[PDB]
Design a protein around this ligand. Structure first.
Ligand SMILES: CCCCCCCCCCCCCCCCCC(=O)OC[C@H](COP(=O)([O-])OCC(O)COP(=O)([O-])OC[C@@H](COC(=O)CCCCCCCCCCCCCCCCC)OC(=O)CCCCCCCCCCCCCCCCC)OC(=O)CCCCCCCCCCCCCCCCC
Ligand SMILES: CCCCCCCCCCCCCCCCCC(=O)OC[C@H](COP(=O)([O-])OCC(O)COP(=O)([O-])OC[C@@H](COC(=O)CCCCCCCCCCCCCCCCC)OC(=O)CCCCCCCCCCCCCCCCC)OC(=O)CCCCCCCCCCCCCCCCC
Ligand SMILES: CCCCCCCCCCCCCCCCCC(=O)OC[C@H](COP(=O)([O-])OCC(O)COP(=O)([O-])OC[C@@H](COC(=O)CCCCCCCCCCCCCCCCC)OC(=O)CCCCCCCCCCCCCCCCC)OC(=O)CCCCCCCCCCCCCCCCC
Ligand SMILES: CCCCCCCCCCCCCCCCCC(=O)OC[C@H](COP(=O)([O-])OCC[N+](C)(C)C)OC(=O)CCCCCCCCCCCCCCCCC
Ligand SMILES: CCCCCCCCCCCCCCCCCC(=O)OC[C@H](COP(=O)(O)OCCN)OC(=O)CCCCCCCCCCCCCCCCC
Ligand SMILES: CCCCCCCCCCCCCCCCCC(=O)OC[C@H](COP(=O)(O)OCCN)OC(=O)CCCCCCCCCCCCCCCCC
Ligand SMILES: CCCCCCCCCCCCCCCCCC(=O)OC[C@H](COP(=O)(O)OCCN)OC(=O)CCCCCCCCCCCCCCCCC
Ligand SMILES: CCCCCCCCCCCCCCCCCC(=O)OC[C@H](COP(=O)(O)OCCN)OC(=O)CCCCCCCCCCCCCCCCC
Ligand SMILES: CCCCCCCCCCCCCCCCCC(=O)OC[C@H](COP(=O)(O)OCCN)OC(=O)CCCCCCCCCCCCCCCCC
Lengths: 54, 459, 98, 64, 120, 63, 53, 140, 345
């Protein structure tokens, strides 16, 4: 328990989740073509959200 | 309260303006005098609580914690004096500043009459313990210990902040006495259950459960002696104090919402005493013993009986004193041998007779011995738990048996037996550390002689 | 007028899509920027002429001045990019990711 | 030193999750909790029912 | 949220209505703490420039403490004006709309039946 | 000094805290009502100014 | 300044005196219900200004 | 689709399990499409076939998560007759996390997804029960 | 350089935001934004390295696109109502386009990708000027339209900026990228509190500016670029360590540092407006922010990383630190929590 499973459950799993998510977030290449494509997707999502919520 | 806080605030200019050959002497003497000054709010003739200020207040619950903090500051100075002897003067004064700031912030935390100010000083105390553990710890794992301690505390404390601001927006005041008087029952909803969990889980992290407790042995192993002292003698009790304070506004739904934590506390005290039995590290053993005693405190506060609260306060003060004493004794052996392995130094009663006497008295305090506030607190917690449900006596009995077993195992395996004769570097004793043991043990005797002070709110 | 304003808004939208979708040419991106500028100029001029807002007629001249300033700065940056590499490729300028 | 390090700081680096130890950890961390939960819950429900129906009397229990 | 109130002259640090309010007593914990912060600023500046921490730069420390106390006094007077006029506007709105803020009558602890939750 | 000093000081502290709580609740209600319907001094969102409207006779009579 | 040298020994006593002064100032600050509680509310005595200072 | 997501809550839980499963599957599919669009924009595939394969994989994964969530939640509300109960949503969220772990081929991801998504779904059910206003209009 | 063009460029950098925040016409706000962008570009590309050229190019095209969308919103408002200010009855589409474009000007997620790229490859003082001064004019425009904003889009942008900033700063080891992700997180907090209280986003902006001015100054003192470079600070400038640690803790939001005050008061206002879910998520990701700050503190202050031989010559030489700017801002950004009622307005 105290050397394997509580450690595996709360702190190590939280750290593993956040390091996986920060790798996934900061997996960007320095291509402004990709950055502007993502910005276009953001604009489309904002337009759709406005047209849905109204 | 200001007559106690301000001399402790002026301790810092004294620390930084004293000569390097007089710093320890001056700060230790004036911190002893500050503890003597802090003895003045035991003058409680009436049942009315001493409300000195619009922001500072006293209590039969807050007063022993304040006196224990003010008493423990010179003890931390004495304990940390030797292992900083080959050090820069600026680093020594900074360490003393960390200890003094801890004392100031903890006195303000215990005397604070507002929950939001209590939260602010709670995290303010979270800071210098992290600095002490990381900057002056010995091994590599001090950084991991600091991370675990800090973020266990912070992930606990953020929902506490949300809950406190919710209560302030609901009732308008967030003052302890106003809440205690015009407390309102809760209509037993899921939002109220989450509010209860948010305002409890910070303190349930701070004094260890069976779950989140993994930061405590790491921090205690990696911390220096003053850090172990302040942690195991004040900060867990700070969590318990917060639970006793904030439980009053959660009247109707604690009686079912406290079920998982009572079970967690009882089974966890059994498991942590078992770990103490099969533990190879002395500081780890003392840390897990602290987990077990604080599990008893958690169960008493959750069941919310006057006997339970009184026993919780008595176990708080008694456990703080005896855990600091055990940590100081272990640190004396560690300063001799530079290793915390328990099986390595064995026949120390031969060369250290009165240190073995202090070991014996500390372990007799660690287990429940009837002329001691330790047994007073544990016995009244047992009475309240048996009133809560008759079947808790099985878990209590198992815990008491294993507690006696690990305490006497500690004494036999580190004091008795054949002396490890290869250890040449066993210096006889320091008058400083013998004085440190005496200054831990004599207040235990005096509080045993008059236990009306350690009795808390309920009687 | 509403049909023409709808067409001008769609022209701005097309030039914005051109700005956002890169095709290997910083110069083409600057061209899309100036197409957006021209669409905004025509929209502002038509609005002011329709509403007879002769007091607000200096607004298209102001946006033209500041737009030519930003086009000037973009051409200077394209000159520096070409001096650095020699190809003027937006995928070629990528080394700030690490 | 090796014995202490292997007993303390090596266990999680050399721990690998298997279904056997997953089952062992689940039962050892939850079974006692659920068992004592049902024990205390049944006992307290019986006590509360007896008090509410009046068949349980506190003979001289003044301080609880 | 209070910028649109009637009589709000723009970019005015202290209007004449602030002259109706009692000033800080010039030895109050806010200004003493501001002076302490100025002194600590001087000490930290000396330590960063690698001078003696207090033996050097006495004119600098004096200027730091004086400037901190001066600016703190005038800012504190402005904040006192702001809190006072917020309270004044709130009380005026309460007096203007009494039907939205009824003086609710509370009854004694002899008619209300608080439920009792025993802790057996 | 005696028990009466602490007793009366506690009464004064309680009165101060109760008045502060009442005023905080009043401030919350006042702010909510003002933002819901802006009619008091607060939440007065701006409006184009009267003093820049040209009221002189124009070139066209129909103005 | 006749003694001089170890002047720092007045720092903590000065802090203690100032803390007692601040407590006295807070007592003077509260000052409400001097004899207005229902519990005590006694007469002001032929030679007495206030009940507690 | 605002009226679609409102038609999710037009009936109480344990009624129209097919409708609730279809609505939750559509919501998961929309979320997977958005996530796949971000993924193929920021991290481009080696070719259009791999891009379309990744979009389809992500969309099917999120649709399976939503379908299993809605199905298990409605099935729980059917089999124990109390619709207004957050444990049904916790069970459904755990089933959705197990679906995520099955798609990702990792039991650790299955367990973490179960716990986190069950907590999120239970919190969502409590919010819809007791009127928690997500994205509130400014009032004070 | 040249003093004449230094004066011209720096005066235009000053003049841009001043015109934006002091002008009541949306067109003049837009020309202030244009002034700021065009003036700050030559200060960015000044060392004439490929990284500086790339950063200047990325910044130019991003801010030009965002300003074009802003001008589209202004022209559409002028078409709809005939005025040059969004008064009360404009179109929500126009307002949402304004918010999106000003978010891309500010650099908060999911428009945040250029900000660590531009901050990297740029000298530290220009990074300071960007991350502090360039974020006042778009925030001024956002504060001007304080009502009539979409709280849903505001809260979505705020929560994703705080999440992505926490994750990015957690990953990064470059100091300038760390500062950029800190900027993204704090801008998320400011944008979160924007539609409910302009005073609180102004307060958070001021706290952030006075917190990250001396952080950049301390980076500028030793030209420390990486975690290792800031780690060998005990040999270079050992007096810096306590202030560096306290300012990093204040950026983390730990009590009793004054950086706890903006998060505390923003959470208070969001409690007053019943947004507990958003407030709780924002607080947890702020804890993540504090984690990467604390790893930085472990590297620079609480441990002593190994040093090299030439630091002996560095100790032989003498240095110079700006008076009245570093120590004042460090003290005001660490030990000003008990002046919280004076700080809030
Ligand atoms: C659908 C119908 C069919 C279902 C089915 O067949 O289920 C079989 C499946 C077991 O599969 P298996 O044959 O053991 O898998 C072996 C691998 O194929 C081969 O093993 P391997 O070594 O290749 O895999 C490595 C390791 C992969 O690594 C892991 O699995 C990592 C550990 C995951 C969590 C383990 C939880 C148990 C331990 C708790 C310890 C104490 C915690 C504190 C107290 O795999 C395992 O450990 C195997 C067990 C995985 C269990 C996954 C459970 C997911 C749901 C968790 C719900 C929440 C639990 C409580 C959380 C409390 C948080 C406070 O489940 C069951 O029999 C019971 C669970 C049913 C669902 C609930
Ligand atoms: C809420 C309003 C109503 C709904 C509105 C519409 C839906 C809004 C959804 C918002 C939340 C999700 C957003 C996803 C964004 C993209 C994530 C992603 O995949 O990135 C990968 C991509 C890199 O891909 P990669 O390198 O190929 O990764 C390979 C994998 O590791 C390879 O691993 P693998 O093979 O396992 O791949 C499987 C794949 C399959 O998953 C997906 O494809 C994504 C599925 C996401 C589902 C999460 C929500 C589930 C909701 C269920 C609702 C049930 C009913 C309701 C009741 C319960 C309510 C709780 O999983 C992933 O890719 C996981 C990525 C990380 C996800 C972290 C999510 C954390 C929050 C979750 C709760 C929300 O990273 C980025 O693109 C980074 C930049 C992110 C930019 C976007 C930031 C904003 C996003 C939110 C926009 C919200 C709307 C617009 C607001 C205004 C904007 C201006
Ligand atoms: C008192 C506290 C504040 C002190 C500020 C100045 C700090 C300083 O310069 O200390 C050095 C200086 C002593 O230095 P030294 O021995 O002369 O030579 C310097 C070495 O050469 C220096 O050697 P080095 O720097 O070349 O190499 C060593 C290096 C090696 O590097 C290291 O060792 C790195 C250390 C890393 C770990 C520490 C990180 C930071 C920790 C901060 C505190 C955290 C815990 C506290 C509680 C939570 C706070 C959030 O650095 C250090 O060892 C650090 C030196 C500074 C340590 C002291 C830091 C003070 C500020 C932070 C604590 C105070 C605020 C919080 C507590 C508040 C009360 C509870 O300190 C003083 O002189 C203290 C002041 C004493 C006189 C006070 C007189 C008061 C008069 C009042 C009336 C007049 C004004 C009236 C105003 C109102 C008018 C209306
Ligand atoms: C360290 C311990 C961590 C685990 C335990 C933490 C507490 C668990 C139970 C509480 C829910 C989560 C915290 C909420 C804090 C605020 C509570 C509150 O004010 O409740 C009343 C409020 C309700 O407000 P209310 O009561 O005013 O509602 C209105 C009610 N009427 C109309 C009747 C007046 O609850 C919430 O708003 C809860 C929303 C939570 C949204 C965010 C969830 C984040 C994820 C959950 C876990 C977070 C911690 C762990 C992170 C990971 C660690 C590894
Ligand atoms: C039984 C009781 C159950 C109820 C209570 C549950 C909660 C208990 C308390 C929380 C758990 C403990 C968290 C803190 C400890 C774990 C973090 C940690 O120690 O991470 C270490 C690791 C870095 O390791 P490092 O030392 O750098 O590497 C070796 C040398 N370089 O770090 C990393 O790799 C990354 C670490 C990131 C920081 C972790 C702390 C912040 C967590 C934020 C939570 C956010 C919640 C919301 C998430 C989004 C919504 C789901
Ligand atoms: C309050 C919070 C504390 C937190 C920690 C503080 C640490 C620092 C402490 C600083 C000093 C504070 C001392 C506090 C205790 C004071 C003890 C004391 O004098 O109590 C008063 C008592 C007589 O008072 P009285 O009213 O009669 O007692 C109640 C009766 N109804 O007096 C007496 O009875 C006389 C006591 C002194 C005479 C010597 C007693 C010798 C006892 C020998 C016991 C031997 C057996 C010990 C076994 C131990 C086993 C482990
Ligand atoms: C909530 C947490 C749920 C965790 C579920 C884990 C299920 C694991 C099932 C499994 O495969 O158990 C295997 C275990 C031992 O089997 P094995 O791993 O082959 O080891 C041989 C020596 N006993 O099998 C057993 O121990 C048998 C138990 C029979 C009852
Ligand atoms: C009920 C619990 C369902 C748990 C589903 C899950 O996440 O399982 C994880 C597991 C990973 O698959 P893996 O270990 O690679 O082996 C494939 C052989 N079936 O996935 C699987 O084994 C998938 C099995 C098919 C789907 C089962 C549902
Ligand atoms: C709003 C809703 C937000 C939902 C947010 C969560 C989304 C679903 C979960 C996503 C997890 C992504 C990272 C991951 O997979 O973490 C699991 C971690 C690693 O698993 P591994 O076997 O190493 O596989 C490689 C990873 N693909 O595996 C582990 O760390 C194993 C953990 C096993 C025990 C987990 C027990 C519960 C822990 C959390 C308790 C919280 C209270």
């Amino acid at each position: 328990l105290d050397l394997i499973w509580l450690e595996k459950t709360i702190p190590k799993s939280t750290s593993t989740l956040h390091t996986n998510m920060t790798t996934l977030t900061t997996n960007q290449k320095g291509l402004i073509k990709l950055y502007f494509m993502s910005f276009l997707i953001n604009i489309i999502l904002i337009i759709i959200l406005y047209s849905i919520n109204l | 309260m200001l007559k106690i806080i301000l001399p402790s605030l002026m301790l810092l200019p004294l620390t930084w303006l004293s000569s390097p050959k007089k710093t320890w002497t001056n700060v230790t003497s004036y911190s002893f005098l500050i503890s003597l000054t802090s003895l003045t709010l035991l003058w409680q003739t009436d049942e009315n609580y001493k409300n000195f200020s619009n922001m500072f207040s006293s209590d039969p619950l807050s007063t022993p914690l304040i006196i224990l903090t003010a008493w423990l500051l010179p003890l931390m100075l004495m304990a940390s004096q030797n292992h900083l002897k080959k050090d820069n003067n600026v680093l020594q004064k900074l360490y003393i500043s960390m200890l003094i700031s801890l004392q100031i912030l903890l006195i303000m935390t215990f005397s604070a009459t507002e929950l939001i100010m209590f939260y602010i000083l709670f995290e303010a105390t979270l800071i210098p313990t992290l600095i002490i553990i990381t900057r002056w710890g010995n091994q590599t794992e001090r950084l991991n210990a600091g991370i675990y301690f800090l973020f266990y505390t912070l992930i606990g404390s953020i929902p506490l902040l949300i809950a406190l601001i919710l209560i302030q927006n609901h009732v308008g005041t967030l003052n302890l006495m106003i809440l205690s008087f015009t407390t309102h029952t809760l209509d037993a909803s899921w939002s109220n259950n989450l509010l209860w969990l948010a305002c409890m889980m910070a303190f349930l992290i701070k004094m260890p459960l069976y779950g989140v407790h993994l930061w405590l042995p790491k921090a205690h192993v990696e911390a220096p002696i003053a850090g172990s002292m302040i942690l195991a003698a004040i900060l867990l009790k700070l969590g318990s104090y917060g639970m006793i304070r904030i439980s009053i506004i959660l009247d109707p739904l604690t009686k079912y919402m406290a079920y998982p934590f009572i079970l967690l506390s009882l089974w966890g005290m059994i498991m942590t005493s078992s770990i103490c039995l099969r533990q190879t590290d002395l500081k780890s053993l003392i840390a897990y013993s602290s987990v077990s005693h604080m599990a008893l405190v958690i169960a008493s506060i959750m069941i919310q009986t006057p006997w339970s609260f009184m026993g919780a306060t008595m176990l708080m003060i008694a456990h703080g004193l005896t855990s600091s004493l055990l940590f100081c004794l272990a640190n004396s052996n560690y300063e001799r041998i530079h290793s915390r392995t328990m099986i390595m130094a064995r026949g120390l009663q031969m060369v250290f007779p009165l240190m073995a006497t202090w070991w014996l008295m500390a372990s007799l305090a660690n287990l429940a011995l009837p002329p001691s506030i330790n047994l007073m607190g544990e016995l009244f917690i047992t009475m309240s738990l048996f009133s809560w449900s008759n079947f808790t006596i099985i878990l209590m009995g198992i815990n008491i048996i294993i507690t006696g077993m690990y305490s006497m195992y500690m004494i036999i395996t580190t004091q008795r037996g054949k002396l490890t004769n290869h250890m040449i570097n066993l210096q006889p004793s320091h008058t400083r550390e013998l004085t440190l043991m005496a200054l831990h043990m004599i207040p235990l005797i005096l509080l045993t002689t008059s236990p009306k002070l350690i009795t808390g709110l309920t009687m | 007028m509403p049909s023409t304003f709808f067409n001008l808004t769609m022209a701005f939208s097309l030039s914005l899509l051109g700005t956002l979708m890169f095709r290997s040419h910083l110069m083409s991106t600057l061209l899309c920027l100036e197409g957006m500028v021209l669409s905004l100029f025509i929209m502002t001029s038509v609005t002011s002429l329709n509403s007879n807002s002769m007091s607000s007629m200096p607004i298209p001249i102001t946006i033209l001045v500041f737009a030519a300033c930003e086009a000037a700065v973009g051409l200077a940056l394209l000159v520096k990019v070409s001096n650095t590499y020699g190809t003027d490729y937006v995928q070629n300028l990528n080394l700030l990711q690490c | 030193i090796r014995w202490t390090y292997a007993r303390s700081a090596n266990i999680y680096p050399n721990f690998r999750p298997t279904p056997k130890n997953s089952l062992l950890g689940a039962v050892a961390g939850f079974g006692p909790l659920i068992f004592w939960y049902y024990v205390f819950k049944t006992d307290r429900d019986r006590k509360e029912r007896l008090i509410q129906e009046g068949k349980l009397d506190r003979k001289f229990n003044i301080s609880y | 949220m209070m910028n649109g109130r009637p009589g709000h002259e723009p970019l005015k640090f202290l209007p004449d209505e602030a002259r109706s309010l009692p000033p800080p007593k010039l030895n109050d914990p806010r200004l003493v703490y501001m002076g302490l912060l100025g002194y600590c600023t001087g000490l930290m500046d000396n330590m960063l420039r690698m001078r003696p921490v207090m033996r050097a730069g006495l004119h600098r420390q004096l200027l730091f403490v004086t400037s901190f106390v001066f600016a703190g006094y005038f800012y504190l007077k402005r904040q006192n004006y702001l809190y006072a006029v917020k309270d004044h506007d709130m009380f005026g709105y309460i007096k203007l709309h009494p039907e939205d803020f009824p003086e609710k009558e509370k009854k004694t602890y002899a008619e209300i039946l608080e439920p009792f939750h025993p802790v057996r | 000094d005696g028990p009466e000093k602490n007793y009366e000081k506690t009464l004064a502290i309680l009165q101060i805290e109760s008045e502060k709580a009442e005023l905080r609740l009043k401030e919350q209600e006042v702010r909510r009502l003002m933002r819901a319907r802006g009619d008091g001094p607060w939440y007065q969102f701006p409006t184009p100014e009267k003093e820049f409207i040209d009221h002189s006779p124009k070139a066209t009579p129909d103005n | 300044q006749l003694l001089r040298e170890h002047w720092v020994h007045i720092l903590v006593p000065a802090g203690f005196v100032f803390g007692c002064y601040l407590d006295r100032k807070d007592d003077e600050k509260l000052t409400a219900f001097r004899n207005k509680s229902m519990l005590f509310q006694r007469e002001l005595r032929p030679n007495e200004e206030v009940t507690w200072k | 689709v605002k009226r679609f997501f409102e038609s999710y809550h037009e009936v109480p839980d344990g009624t129209q399990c097919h409708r609730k499963t279809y609505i939750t599957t559509a919501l998961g599919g929309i979320c997977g499409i958005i996530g796949s669009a971000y993924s193929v924009s920021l991290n481009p595939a080696d070719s259009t076939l791999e891009a379309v394969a990744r979009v389809g994989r992500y969309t099917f994964t999120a649709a399976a998560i939503g379908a299993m969530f809605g199905l298990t939640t409605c099935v729980s509300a059917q089999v124990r007759e109390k619709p207004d109960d957050p444990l049904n949503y916790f069970i459904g969220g755990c089933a959705g996390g197990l679906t995520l772990g099955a798609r990702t081929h990792s039991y650790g991801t299955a367990a973490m997804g179960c716990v986190y998504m069950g907590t999120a779904a239970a919190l969502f059910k409590i919010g819809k029960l007791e009127g928690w206003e997500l994205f509130p209009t400014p009032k004070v | 350089m040249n003093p004449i063009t230094l004066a011209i460029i720096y005066f235009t950098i000053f003049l841009g935001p001043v015109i934006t925040m002091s002008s009541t016409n949306l067109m003049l706000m837009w020309v202030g934004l244009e002034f700021s962008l065009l003036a700050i570009i030559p200060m960015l590309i000044n060392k004439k390295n490929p990284r500086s050229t790339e950063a200047a190019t990325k910044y130019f095209v991003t801010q030009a696109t965002a300003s074009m969308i802003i001008l589209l919103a202004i022209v559409l408002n002028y078409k709809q109502l005939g005025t040059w200010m969004f008064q009360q009855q404009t179109n929500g589409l126009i307002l949402n386009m304004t918010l999106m474009a000003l978010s891309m000007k500010l650099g908060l997620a999911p428009f945040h990708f250029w900000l660590p790229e531009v901050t990297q490859g740029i000298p530290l003082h220009m990074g300071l000027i960007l991350l502090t001064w360039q974020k006042i004019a778009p925030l001024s425009i956002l504060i001007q339209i304080y009502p009539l904003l979409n709280s849903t889009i505001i809260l979505m942008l705020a929560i994703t900026s705080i999440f992505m900033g926490a994750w990015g700063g957690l990953n990064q080891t470059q100091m300038r990228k760390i500062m950029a992700y800190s900027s993204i997180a704090h801008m998320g907090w400011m944008l979160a509190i924007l539609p409910y209280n302009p005073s609180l986003t102004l307060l958070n902006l001021m706290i952030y500016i006075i917190l990250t001015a001396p952080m950049f100054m301390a980076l500028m003192l030793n030209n420390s670029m990486t975690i290792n470079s800031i780690s060998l600070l005990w040999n270079k400038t050992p007096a810096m360590l306590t202030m560096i640690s306290l300012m990093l803790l204040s950026l983390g939001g730990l009590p009793p540092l004054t950086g706890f005050l903006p998060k505390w008061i923003i959470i208070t206002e969001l409690m007053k407006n019943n947004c507990l879910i958003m407030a709780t998520l924002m607080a947890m990701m702020a804890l993540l922010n504090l984690f990467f700050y604390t790893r930085l503190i472990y590297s620079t202050s609480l441990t002593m990383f190994p040093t090299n031989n030439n630091s002996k010559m560095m100790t032989h030489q003498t240095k110079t630190k700006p008076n009245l700017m570093f120590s004042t801002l460090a003290i005001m950004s660490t030990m000003t929590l008990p002046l919280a009622p004076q700080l809030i307005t």
